[PDB]
Structure formats: C-alpha cells, structure tokens
Amino acid sequence: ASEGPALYEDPPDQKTSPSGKPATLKICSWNVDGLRAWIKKKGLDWVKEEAPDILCLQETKCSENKLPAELQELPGLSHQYWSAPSDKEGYSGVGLLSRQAPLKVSYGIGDEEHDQEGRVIVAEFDSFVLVTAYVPNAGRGLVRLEYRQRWDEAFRKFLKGLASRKPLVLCGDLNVAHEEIDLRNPKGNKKNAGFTPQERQGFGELLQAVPLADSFRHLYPNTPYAYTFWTYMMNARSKNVGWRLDYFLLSHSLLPALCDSKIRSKALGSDHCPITLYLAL
Ligand SMILES: [Mg+2]
Questions:
Q1: Is 39 helix (H, G, I), strand (E, B) or coil?
Q2: Residue 173, annotated ligand binder?
Q3: CB 115 within 8 A of CB 155
Q4: Which of 19, 51, 121, 129 is most buried (most C-beta within 10 Å)?
Q5: Mapping DSSP to helix (H, G, I), strand (E, B) and coil, where does residue 105 land?
Q6: Which structural domains are found in the chain, ordered by start?
C-alpha cells in the first residue's frame, strides 16, 4: 500500500572483461516455480532467446524420472542433470543443463541431514567448479529458521572446501536479500523469511569465509530497485516491490574474468526472473 512503482532498467550487456577479453561462458540461472508450470508460462522462450552455455534451474518440483518432454526442445543444452528430494515427490529440486558435459557431477553437500531435499548440483569443469543451489526457505512464521542456520553453516563449510581446489561459481536462489538495497521494503520484512538478521548474517559469513564476491553488487554497488523475485500477490511485480534472492557468487580469483551480471527483469515464466552471468574464462 505504501509503495508505488520504482523504475529499474538493467544496463546493456557488457560482454568483454576489463582485459578486453570477450565472454567465453554465459550462465543463466532461474527459479522456475515448477518446471511444468514454467513451461506452460512460456519459460523456454527466454531460454531460447538467451542461448546460454549453461542453464541452472531451481524449484523444478521434478525428479529425473518425471521430466517434461519439452526439455528436448533445448538441443544446444544436451547434457542435463537433475536432483530432487529423496522421498521422490514434487517439491524443491534443481537442474543443470549444459552445452558441454562437466568433468564430474555430484549432488548435495556431503551431509546426510542436508542432502534429502534435492537442493544442490555440483558440476566440475576444467578451470572452475559450478554449484547451483535452492537454499531452504526459513518458512512462514520462521518455523524453519533454526534449520536454515544449520544449513547455512554446512553449506559454507562445503563451499570453502570446493574453493580450496578450484575457483568457484555459486548460483541460484539463496533465499535471502543480503542488504536493505536488496529489497523494496526492508523496514517491514526484518521478521520475515528472506530478510531475518540471521539469514543476512549467514550470507555475510559466506562471502567472508569462502571467500566469495556478489557479482551483481560488485559491478553495481549503489544501484537500487534491482530485484529477482516478486510475490504473485497484489500487483507486486508491476510496482517492482521485490527482493533480490538470486545471485552469482564468485571466487575472488574470477573477478578479472567477470564481464557482467544481469537481471532479466522482463522475462516471464515464474515469480522470479532469470539472472545471467558473462565470464571471460
Ligand atoms: Mg515458488
């Protein structure tokens, strides 16, 4: 009620690095709010336009055994990997679709407590490791906040381990708006999932410990009203009353390869929009 529209126009795609090196890798990440729902809402139209080298999907609500046939309409992303909850049901779930097969694909974070909900794919390539995640939400009434804190610690420790061997790119729906600039209404959301001090602090801990840089915020440190999620309710997207929940976090060693980190605000299909990373690897 207190918010009207706030403008955001994502800047043009910067496709060369500081060294002048053209981008060699384009990664698109997207919380699809259910793979079938997303397909019905023309989600694949953006994927075809974007033509990424790697597509990471969160909240697929689908196991590798029950995938929709339409995913065959992406022949340029022929190597497809899927994780889903162990109970074999339609919730959570992540996907990674790639032009080239990774050297190795793994699922989860090496901890039984945290590996039952199909939340993480690890894809190792020659020069870097890619992780895509759908981080557990703290829940309505914060009923899952204690668990989320345990998740955060385990995930941080796991990523620090990976980064000790190869440069890391982490992408996906991290279910937190880091700072006040990362959501439209910080004042009214400090007791809500995604903007609790515990969640924000966890994100800060992750950046420091691994370490990782927030690609978007690194490039655009002072840019407001840049969001990746809007509630389906109450004209939130039309008013740009949103949250930045979706990130590409990078090892510091990859910052010289960083060309751009995009937010595809106008792309429909979900309550999140896609985000896209350009790297000159
Ligand atoms: Mg959803």
A1: helix
A2: yes
A3: no
A4: 121
A5: strand
A6: 1-281 (3.60.10.10)
Of 228, 212, 204, 13, the C-alpha closest to 129 is: 212
Q: Structure tokens of 216?
A: 């978007």
**Which H or E element spans position 157?**
helix 145-163
Q: CA 50, 10, 250, 129: dihedral to nearest 10 degrees?
A: -10
Q: Which two tokens stand for residue 97?
A: 């679709």
Mapped onto helix, strand or coil, the DSSP state of residue 11 is coil
Q: 17 C-alpha vs ligand 1 centroid, how far in Å? A: 34
Residue 185 annotated as part of some ligand binding site: no
In the reported structure, the alpha carbon of residue 1 is separated from the centroid of ligand 1 by a whole-number distance in angstroms of: 23
Instruction: Give the Cα separation of 4 and 51 in Å (integer).
Output: 34
Structure-token pair, residue 131: 């992780």
Q: How far is the CA of 34 from the centre of ligand 1 (A)?
A: 7
Report the run of H or E that residue 75 belongs to, with start and end: none
Strand partners for 149: none
Count of all residues that appear for the chain in the document: 281
Amino acid of residue 27? I
Strands 258-263 vs 275-279: parallel, antiparallel or unpaired: antiparallel
